[PDB]
Each structure stands twice: as C-alpha cells, then as structure tokens.
Design an enzyme around this catalytic site. Structure first.
Site, PDB file in Angstrom:
ATOM      1  N   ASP B  50      -0.869  -2.424  -2.411  1.00 22.97           N
ATOM      2  CA  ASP B  50      -0.367  -1.943  -3.686  1.00 22.97           C
ATOM      3  C   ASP B  50       1.153  -2.081  -3.700  1.00 22.97           C
ATOM      4  O   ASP B  50       1.717  -2.782  -2.864  1.00 22.97           O
ATOM      5  CB  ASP B  50      -0.758  -0.468  -3.870  1.00 22.97           C
ATOM      6  CG  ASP B  50      -0.208   0.448  -2.769  1.00 22.97           C
ATOM      7  OD1 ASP B  50       0.357  -0.035  -1.762  1.00 22.97           O
ATOM      8  OD2 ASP B  50      -0.351   1.681  -2.919  1.00 22.97           O
ATOM      9  N   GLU B 406      -8.972  -2.522   3.521  1.00 23.50           N
ATOM     10  CA  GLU B 406      -7.632  -1.951   3.286  1.00 23.50           C
ATOM     11  C   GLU B 406      -6.666  -2.466   4.363  1.00 23.50           C
ATOM     12  O   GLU B 406      -7.087  -2.774   5.481  1.00 23.50           O
ATOM     13  CB  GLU B 406      -7.721  -0.416   3.331  1.00 23.50           C
ATOM     14  CG  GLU B 406      -6.401   0.356   3.088  1.00 23.50           C
ATOM     15  CD  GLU B 406      -5.799   0.090   1.713  1.00 23.50           C
ATOM     16  OE1 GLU B 406      -5.474  -1.076   1.413  1.00 23.50           O
ATOM     17  OE2 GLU B 406      -5.592   1.051   0.935  1.00 23.50           O
TER      18      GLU B 406
END
Ligand SMILES: OC[C@H]1O[C@@H](O[C@H]2[C@H](O)[C@@H](O)[C@H](O)O[C@@H]2CO)[C@H](O)[C@@H](O)[C@@H]1O
Ligand SMILES: OC[C@H]1O[C@@H](O[C@H]2[C@H](O)[C@@H](O)[C@H](O)O[C@@H]2CO)[C@H](O)[C@@H](O)[C@@H]1O
Ligand SMILES: [Br-]
Ligand SMILES: [Br-]
Ligand SMILES: [Br-]
Ligand SMILES: [Br-]
Ligand SMILES: [Br-]
Ligand SMILES: [Br-]
Ligand SMILES: [Ca+2]
Ligand SMILES: [Ca+2]
Ligand SMILES: [Ca+2]
Ligand SMILES: [Ca+2]
Ligand SMILES: [Cl-]
Ligand SMILES: [Cl-]
Ligand SMILES: [Cl-]
Ligand SMILES: [Cl-]
Ligand SMILES: [Cl-]
Ligand SMILES: [Cl-]
Ligand SMILES: [Cl-]
Ligand SMILES: [Cl-]
Ligand SMILES: [Cl-]
Lengths: 599, 599
Positions: B50, B406
């Site tokens: 992100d 992730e």
C-alpha cells in the site's frame, strides 16, 4: 341542447389531427406537418394517440364517415361542414386504394408494440425507429376496406373507389379466412370473424350498384353470423363497431328489402340498448344515463349506436318506436356533450369543462419521451371523443388513463354521423374563426450555465435544444453564437491570437465544429458552434432533445485581465442551466431565436 | 544450502522498492520515481503493498535493520551489502527525524481505508486522492521511533539521531499513554500497550550512551510488562514484532547485565519457540517444520525469532543450548528460502519457484484499478518475504490472497538480521549485475479505430493512453498528430480551407484542443490533438488511463475525392481499437512514441 354544428365541425377536424404524411394542402392543424414519409403506403390516419396505421379500424372509420354523408350529406350543407367531411373521407379512401397489392393488400403500417413503447410527436418518429409494413388478405380487414370504398364511391361520386371496392370484396370473399391477419393481434384482433364484414361490404356494394348479385351474397351471409349465446338468434348484445358491422348492415337491409327478419333483428338489437331493454335483457347503464358496453371506449359504442338508432328511427313509421329510438340516440349524444352528472363535455376542445389531457402523443408535444412533461398539452385536440367514464360515471382527466382518455378514429366515426343527424334537425352556427391560433413556447434555444469562471477564462456548459412542436420538426443546419467584448484584452496589450478555445466535453454522436474567434464589429467578437447534422437534436427522448457542449475561452494562464462581465453572451448566466436569449440560434444564416449585439 | 549473500542483497533491495519521494540518488529500482511529494513529511517507507506511512512498524523495521548492523555489520562486509544496508536505514531514520513537531510528532501519512480501496502505482496516487497526516504523542509509536534512532545513532555514528532518540524517548516516557494514537486503528493498533516500547528504547539508549540511568529506567519497566496468561511470568508466548519488542530487549539486557532474570526469560521464550518446547509448551509447528504463530505473517514472526535466537546463542557459551537455538534459527530461515514441502522460496525474485504475485500495488503496475489485470506483475519485488503458508503448509501464489501474499517492511526486518548472521557464517557471492533490466511495455500511445467512414470523410475514435510503469508518471503537455496526404484535395482543385475538422465525442473533463490543419512538407498536413492538462490521463482507473476523442476530417458533403488510404496515420486501422504507431505521441515538442512521415 348543444351547438351540434360546432360539435360536428370539431369532430371532423379531429381527423385532420390524425393525418399521416404527406398532409393535404387544406390541412388546418398548425401543429401537424408531414410525418412518417418513409412509410410503405403514404397518407391515411394514425389510429389513436399513437402512430400505427391499422387498416381495420381505419377502414371502419372511413365507412362510417361515408355512411354519415350517405344519410345526411344534403341535410348538413347549412352547417358548412359537408365539404370538410367529404375531403377528410377522401384522404382515408385514397390510402385504402394505395394499399392494393393485387392478390393481397398492405393492411398495417407500424408495429403496435414498438410504436406504443415511445411517447413523442409524429413528425420525429423516424429518428427513433424504423417502421415495418404488413401484407395479407384477411377477409375482415379486406372486406372492411371494400365497404369503406363502396360507400365512398357513392357519396364522393367516384368510379375509382367503386373499382377498388369490387377488387377488395372479390379478394375477401374468395379468401374467406382471417389467417393472414396477424400484425394487429392484441390491438385489433378479429374477434367476430369475417362473415359480418362480407355482409357489410356486399350490402354497400348493392347500395352502390343496384346489382342484385350483391344482395344475394349479402343474404347468404346472414346464417353464418355469430349467434346470441346458445340461441338461434343472430348476436344482438353488442355494438356496431370496428370488429363487427353486422348491426348496421341489418338496419340497411331492413330499409332496402323491407323484409321482416331484418326489422325483427333491428328492433331486438336496439331495444337491448334502450332503457326499457329487450324482454328483461339490457346493456348495462350508468346511473347518469350512459349505455355502457365495456370498460374500453364506452362513449364510442354508445354514440355509434345513437347513429344506428337515428337511421333506423328515420326509416320506420311507427310513432312509438320512432320516439323510443330517437330519445335513446339523442340521450347518448347529449351525455357525451355534457348531459351527465358532472355537466361536462367528453369532447376535447368543446363545451363545458372538456378533457384537456387526452392520451395522444402529438397533441401533448413532449420532447423527452415522458407523459408527465409537459404537464399541460401544448396542443388542442379539437373534436376528439374520449373513452369516457367508468360504469359508475366516474372520470378524471389524466394523461396516464389510457382507457378513459383514449382517443381514436373509430371513437369519432359513428359520433360524426349522429352529430350530422342532430345538426340537420336543430341547426346551429359553426365557429367562424376556427381553429384559433395557439400560444406557442420557444422551440429552438440554448440553455447555458457558467461551468467554471477563472481570472483567465470562462467555461460555458451549453445545451442546444430542439423542443419543437408547431409542428415538431428537424433542422439540419443548426448553430449558435457566443459573443464577447475583447476591449480589456487589447487594453492589456494582448490580441485575439492570445485567446484559446478548448472543449471540455462534447456529447457523443453530435458532430460539431467551433469557429475561430471571429470579428463582428468594434471590439465585439464571437465563436459559432455548428452542428453539422442538427437533425440529431430532436425531441425524441432525454438524451436527444439537447446537444451538450462544454467550451472554454481562455487568456493565458497567469494573466489578470479577462473580463466576462462585458461579454454579451455572459449576461444573466449563473451556475445553473437556464434558457438564454443572448446565445442566439441560427438555421443556416437565419436567426431563429435570441438577440445579437446591436443588430 | 542457500546463497545467503544473494538473499541478503535482495532482502535489502526490497526497502528501496518501498521508498516514498523524494528518492535518494542511489535508489536502484527502475520502476520507482518520486511519489507522494505533497506529503506532510517526505521520504520514509510505504508500509506494505500500500502507500500509507505507518510510523510504528516503520520505526520497528528501522530499529531491526539497525540491530542487524549492530550485531553483524563487521561480519557482512565481505557480502558487499553493508553500505547498502546502512544507507537504506538512514533513509528511514531521516524520515523519523523529519516527523518532529516539538510537543508531538507526525505519526502517519495517509488514510488507511482510502489508501487500500485503490489499486495503483505510488507515483500517481495523488491524482486519485488527497493524503491526510496525523499528529500525536502515543507512547508506543514515539517510543519505537526513539528506539530506532538510538540504535541508528550507534551503527551510523550519528549525533543527530541520538539527539532525537533522547527527545522522543522523553516524550514517550512523559506521556505514558497511547490515547493520541488513533489513525492506525485496526492496521497497527497498540495491542500490548506502551511499556515494552519504553523498555526497548531505554535499553537502546543505554547501549548508545553507557549512561546507567537508562539501564535503571529499563529495569524499572519490566514489572509493568504484560504477564503470561494469569501467571506472574512476563509474557513469553509470542514473537518480537512491531507491536512488542520486550523479547529482544530482555535478550539485550541478559548480555548487557549478565543477570539471571534476563537469561531465564530469554531461555523460556526461545525454548517455547523450539521443537523441544518449554516445560511441554510450544508454538504450533507445521508438519513441514515452520513455527507458526498466527494466520497473519507466520514467516515474519518465525524469521524474526530466528534473528533473536542467533543473537542469544552468540551471546552464551553452553554448546548444547547454542546448538539448539542455532538449529531452530537456521531451520526457520531455510524454510523461508525453500526447505519446505514444496521446495519453494517464499522470497520474491529469489531461489526456486518464488512467489510472483505478491499483494503489492506498485510492483504489479496496473493502469485500471484492478488486481486481475495485468495478469502478471510488471515488476519484480526482489527480496520481499511473503506472509507465507497456513498451519498445514498450504499456500497458493495469488494476488488476491492479502494474507499469504502480504509483503511489508516488518516482514523483512528481522529477516535481514538473520540473513546477516547466515552470510557471516557461510559467505556467498552477491549477484554482480543486480538488478537486471526489465522488459518494458509501451507506456504512452494512441489506440485508434475507424469509427465511421464515407466518400467525403474519415472519423477516428482515438484513446490517448498513459499506462506508464517504468516508473509510473504524469505528463502534462501531451499531444498526438494525425497525418494526412492532401494530394487528392489539391488534385480536385480544393484547398486546405475546404476541409472541415469536427468532433463527435470529447470525454468529459479532458480539456482538449485540435489544431487547424497544419502543413508538414509536400502535400502532407496534420492535425494536433493537445490535452491542456495531460496529467488527467493517468493509470489510476478504468476511465482515467486513456482520454477518448472522436474526430472527423471532412471534405465538402457530396464530393467523392476524399482519399484516406494515402494518409500516414490511417495505416493499419480497422473498426476495432488497436495501438497504432502512426499517430505519434509528444511530450511538448519531443516525440515519445510512434513514427512521423519521413523522420
Ligand atoms: O364477445 C363480445 C363481443 O366482442 C366483440 O369484440 C370486442 C372484444 O371483445 C373487445 O375485447 C375489444 O376491445 O373490442 C372488440 C370489438 O368491440 C365482438 O366484435 C362481438 O362480436 C362480440 O359479441
Ligand atoms: O494477544 C496475543 C498477542 O497479540 C500481539 O498483538 C498482535 C495482535 O493480536 C494481532 O491481531 C496483530 O495482527 O498483530 C499483533 C502483533 O503481533 C501482542 O503484541 C502480544 O503482546 C500479545 O501477546
Ligand atoms: Br374559435
Ligand atoms: Br494582465
Ligand atoms: Br436582435
Ligand atoms: Br498531541
Ligand atoms: Br542478476
Ligand atoms: Br520516425
Ligand atoms: Ca368481424
Ligand atoms: Ca470581455
Ligand atoms: Ca507495545
Ligand atoms: Ca489523402
Ligand atoms: Cl398473403
Ligand atoms: Cl326506452
Ligand atoms: Cl325520427
Ligand atoms: Cl386542450
Ligand atoms: Cl412542464
Ligand atoms: Cl529443539
Ligand atoms: Cl552460535
Ligand atoms: Cl515477479
Ligand atoms: Cl494482462
């Protein structure tokens, strides 16, 4: 009781509102222009408040207008309406002739489902959809076409109509089948079958020619007619109508032959319609005195029966029967004109408190495929007899009520004949200045808003609108101008070359050009926005009625001189879209809306 | 075995992939540019795949890279990676210093919810959203910032870092509250509370300064640490991690003080992580031999414990214990590198069958705000340790698996320390030509189709694309040219002013101009389509990555001479949109894609 001459005048004019293109030179309706010119067969009438040509009710309506003239043509010359009725009839009959295809006819133009899905004016429908035609040899539709032409040939003294009446009758009588009559199913299905049409047509051919072969054919069809329920009597418990004209044929044959079987039928049928009934059987009546046959078009059925009753009463000598049938007929016409619990006319544009929201697309005059906008009809559908009230006399004038506010060729047809009979007897003065001109609203115009203002630019959102209605129409060479005063530009030491025009949005499918900034006079300059095919701006739906452009006129970024407050076309603009007269609209070189600087 | 030097090399490079703008001159990542330049505090690392800067895990990750240098910096000089690790750490520390706001710090840049809702590259995110910043003095986040700067001051010999470390520790210690730490809720909430951070920071300040007052503060915090369940023992059944560094602090205190209480804790904690357990109690193990603490980031936790186990083992003399802890540590690192049931690396761009679809927006390189397109990542996120398998060793490489795939600063941080220890022991040669150049796609180009064609015009649908990714970037002064041969116009006796340029669709919000038709050479002329703010063409979503224009070039209506087949820009066009090199794209006056008539 009413001015029946004025009622008749208006009831005839209704048919001019219904005419498909090309319109005759004498068409009196300012809001009607040539429409559906790509149709396979031109002219004739749109059926109702739609744009389909349905030959069964169309031919029925023509046959009834013919019958009105046949009975009462001489007797209405004083009303001044005979020539109007005659040429309106001839318009429909010319269409019926033009449908000939030899061993078949064109029997429909337009698809009911597709036509009815769209709400807008006749003159612009080809921008929305492409209209089919339908060919066949249905005995009911062809037979009705023959009948209309047969009576037409008599009252209009026309040999061509008689030639075609014979052609069509021979075809219908040879075919003896409704199997190729399908395109009107669910709209004007053949319910009763075709024997009544052959009876009706052969009766009129006998009246036209005096040839007994036609009377023999007519009499041969009567045993083939539908029975009343499970009895042996010919069906009598309904109305003469677009689907079934045996009623009127039996009356004509009673008078032509004098035979008792026809008189017996006519009396049984008419008695069932009167308040006294026929041996305990009777059509439903509203408490307000309207004979109410069905939910759909009760006024149509009652007023048609009034015409049959007048013709029958005029043809007999018995005083009691004459008075009974005459009183029935007049009571039904008078109800339609205002003799009802609301004291109101059910004829658009006539009498006291007439309907103002008939279910009629072109009279309404929308630009966006909606019934609710505009909230008032832009045009007056003079003469249209509406569907009418429910079984309890209830009614509200509502465009959404596609039953009670329906209007149609067949609703007016018998009604015209009955009005001829009443004008004959009572006289009356038609309206001298009829029709009076309508108040118009603006048709082509720009709505604009300031989309963004900056110390170096103006950005305008502009919608060029076509909400035409007098008549609805298409203009190819549409443009509008945005005028500026460039005094402040020159005073700051800049030139026209330093002002840049850009586009921030241009609507899909709207071919558009923007001119360079152009000198008018002094320090007044403009840009012209031209739509190359402006016919794509058209009142057919939400997206089509206006073309949207967002344009920006900008001095260089960083400059502080730009002043739109002295610009002619900026005057009165806000951040909300609004019609503006200061961005004038042109059709070619002709200004059609707005104002120009000085000028 | 493995090449731990190569693994370390790549694991450090991961941090360069995470750098926010302005990038240092030494950044080695060809697909990264200055991003988020409007942020309240510049530089530092994006947390995961992100674009939020979350200071708690950012500072923890920096503290761990500092710890790696503190233990093993001398021992890795041979791998060639020391200078890479040092300057990577300094970039994060500089950000931590730049967060100072006197009585508080900036502790976050970006709203987690808005950031995560969008899928696209760092360099373009300011076109999608405005990024807020958050200020506070939460003891956990400020304490971890202090710890990172304290170890950083030692290993980078930097007095400024020590000054801020002291100031931040004092702020955290005065505040003794996480009440002002709000913006990370649900992403990096303070779960353990803040006493462990005060312990960790004071321990590092003791190691930096030798000031026994810091040692006394550190020892004062240990009775405030959370207990293990309802017992009197300090919590030991978890991992050293971004939320809780008391584990590593206790190990450091064992070495620094020699006190039995710290060794007892260190061995209880580390035994619980080993297969042999602590008193019959142990972390869960997968059948394949991974110590598996939680669903989220199991490799992160196990590789972090590997580093702690290495450090503690190196600090003691007992050969049995040393072997037990060393075997544990190496087993966990080796599992991550490929010693597992699938024989596969869990480090992107390293080893056998590494993950290729990490959950990382900028390495993916989309233009459409979608994860599924492009179906393959456009960039290699070398060195990223993924979340890893489930408790049963299950795993699938899937961009949609935001758990197993992730990647994050904190995942790599302990892992780097452990790799330092292993390359210290086993050596290895780093890759000489790393990183190798990527295969690039076309980034700015027109896709065009013939929208409509006739004997008097050509209409083009053109989409000007920005699918940049090397790095993603914005170009304001974008234009493209459409070249035609007007030979046939002149051959027809017509001039340039007889050809009309119009528009048929201009996408909303894309301010655009089209030049007049401009001479190039001979009978070759062109129009230039220019976007005034080309930065609104950007790879941020389905509607933004390309600007659509439909333009028409037309001879007069009725003429039949128009000839598009000699037009340079018409070559190869079909009715379907396709990239074309014959409508070249420009940044200002420089061609950036395509070809020009001649050259
Ligand atoms: O069955 C009663 C009656 O029907 C007449 O057809 C009607 C049809 O029932 C109705 O739904 C439609 O709206 O109108 C037609 C024509 O009025 C039919 O013509 C009669 O023969 C029959 O007795
Ligand atoms: O209660 C167990 C353990 O939680 C640790 O916090 C976790 C948190 O529970 C988990 O939801 C999140 O994903 O990660 C954090 C950090 O691993 C906390 O650090 C421990 O003190 C506590 O023992
Ligand atoms: Br009048
Ligand atoms: Br100025
Ligand atoms: Br004027
Ligand atoms: Br605060
Ligand atoms: Br390489
Ligand atoms: Br070239
Ligand atoms: Ca019938
Ligand atoms: Ca001005
Ligand atoms: Ca904590
Ligand atoms: Ca050419
Ligand atoms: Cl046929
Ligand atoms: Cl009666
Ligand atoms: Cl009478
Ligand atoms: Cl009205
Ligand atoms: Cl309105
Ligand atoms: Cl063990
Ligand atoms: Cl060891
Ligand atoms: Cl990859
Ligand atoms: Cl793809």
């Amino acid at each position: 009781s009413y001015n029946y001459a004025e009622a008749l005048q208006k009831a005839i004019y209704f048919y001019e509102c219904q005419q498909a293109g090309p319109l005759p030179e004498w068409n009196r309706v300012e809001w009607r222009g040539d429409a559906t010119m790509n149709d396979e067969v031109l002219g004739g009438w749109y059926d109702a408040g739609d744009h389909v040509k349905f030959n069964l009710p169309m031919a029925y309506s023509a046959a009834m207008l013919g019958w009105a003239l046949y009975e009462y043509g001489d007797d209405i010359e004083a009303s001044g309406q005979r020539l109007h009725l005659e040429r309106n009839l001839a318009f429909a009959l010319d269409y019926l002739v033009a449908c000939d295809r030899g061993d078949s006819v064109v029997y429909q133009i337009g698809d009911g489902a597709a036509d009815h899905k769209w709400w807008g004016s006749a003159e612009v429908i080809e921008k929305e959809m492409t209209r089919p035609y339908f060919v066949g040899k249905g005995s009911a539709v062809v037979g009705q076409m023959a009948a209309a032409l047969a009576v037409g040939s008599i009252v209009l003294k026309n040999d061509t109509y008689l030639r075609y009446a014979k052609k069509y009758f021979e075809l219908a009588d040879a075919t003896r089948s409704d199997s190729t009559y399908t395109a009107a199913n669910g709209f004007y299905s053949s319910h009763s079958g075709f024997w009544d049409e052959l009876l009706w047509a052969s009766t009129w051919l006998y009246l036209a020619t005096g040839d007994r072969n036609y009377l023999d054919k007519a009499e041969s069809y009567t045993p083939k007619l539908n029975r009343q329920n499970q009895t042996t009597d010919i069906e009598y418990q309904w109305a003469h109508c677009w689907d079934d004209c045996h009623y009127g044929a039996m009356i004509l044959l009673a008078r032509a032959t004098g035979k008792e079987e026809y008189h017996k039928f006519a009396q049984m049928h008419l008695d069932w319609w009167t308040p006294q009934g026929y041996n305990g059987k009777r059509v439903a009546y509203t408490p307000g005195g309207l004979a109410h046959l069905d939910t759909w078009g009760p006024l149509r059925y009652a007023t048609t029966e009034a015409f049959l009753a007048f013709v029958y009463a005029d043809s007999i000598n018995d005083p009691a029967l004459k008075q009974k049938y005459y009183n029935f007929a007049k009571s039904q016409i008078d109800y339609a004109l205002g003799s009802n619990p609301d004291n109101r006319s059910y004829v658009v544009g006539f009498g006291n408190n007439p309907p103002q929201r008939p279910h009629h697309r072109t009279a309404h005059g929308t630009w966006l495929d909606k019934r609710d906008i505009p909230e008032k009809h832009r045009h007056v559908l003079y003469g249209a007899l509406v569907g009418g009230p429910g079984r309890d006399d209830s009614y509200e004038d509502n465009i959404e009520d596609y039953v009670k506010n329906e209007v149609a060729c067949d609703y007016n047809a018998g009604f015209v004949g009955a009005l001829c009979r009443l004008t004959a007897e009572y006289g009356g003065t038609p309206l001298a200045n009829f029709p009076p001109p309508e108040q118009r609203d603006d048709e082509f115009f720009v709505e604009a808003a300031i989309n963004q203002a900056s110390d170096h630019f103006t950005e305008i959102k502009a919608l060029l609108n076509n909400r035409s209605s007098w008549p609805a129409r298409l203009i190819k060479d549409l443009s509008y101008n945005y005028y500026m005063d460039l005094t402040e530009v020159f005073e700051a030491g800049y030139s026209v070359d330093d002002i840049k025009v850009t586009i921030g949005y241009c609507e899909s499918g709207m071919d558009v050009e923007i001119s360079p900034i152009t000198h008018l006079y002094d320090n007044i300059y403009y840009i012209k926005i031209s739509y190359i095919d402006g016919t794509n701006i058209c009142p057919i739906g939400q997206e089509q009625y206006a073309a949207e452009l967002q344009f920006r006129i900008a001095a260089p970024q960083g400059t502080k001189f730009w002043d739109p407050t002295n610009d002619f076309s900026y005057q009165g603009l806000t951040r909300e879209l609004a019609k503006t007269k200061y961005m004038p609209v042109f059709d070619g070189a002709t200004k059609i809306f707005g104002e120009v600087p000085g000028g």
